[PDB]
Amino acid sequence: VSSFEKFEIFPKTSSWPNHETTKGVTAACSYAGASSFYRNLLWLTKKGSSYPKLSKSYVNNKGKEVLVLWGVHHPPTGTDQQSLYQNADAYVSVGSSKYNRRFTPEIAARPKVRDQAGRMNYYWTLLEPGDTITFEATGNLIAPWYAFALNRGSGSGIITSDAPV
Amino acid sequence: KSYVNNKGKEVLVLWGVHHPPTGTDQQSLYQNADAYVSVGSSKYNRRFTPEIAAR
């Protein structure tokens, strides 16, 4: 990939009216001494007490591949599940024309990594010129916020080096 | 059960998960019709179910 165009696939301030999009946010993604989160994904929590089925679709009209990234949260014994997403029996489903996977919360307490005892899984898929991608979820979705239109070329690729630029 | 690796080297841990045939046997061994087995470390993490099935 020799270039891309980042774009906001589901704008944060416009996409999620009946879900909570603001706070949080974790200590583990701290920016300048305050809790934060990834710039390119959105941790959607329940808007006081309810978390209805969301269904967002996006159609790839960029005329090139779109890289979409998202996450699925697995809270520790929750409680936390209930306190974030309400729905004890929640699911997250992502499908396109090609790809298709169904994720569950997997309530499980794990050795604290960055003071955190839940885990978050990260996924990606390349959406082909033309295709639709549908997200359906009743909790645990770390929704995409920004995504990438890819340009393939001979500007490929990746090195590890400590030489100065 | 938890174990902390203080050997100052890698520890290989092995375990099993049983899938009984139509049980009954499940009930007769483990009581809990709706049982689960969860193993996690800092790196690894998997959740197993009985998969009652006669083979």
Swiss-Prot record, chain A:
The organism's place on the tree of life at top rank: Viruses
Protein name: Hemagglutinin HA1 chain
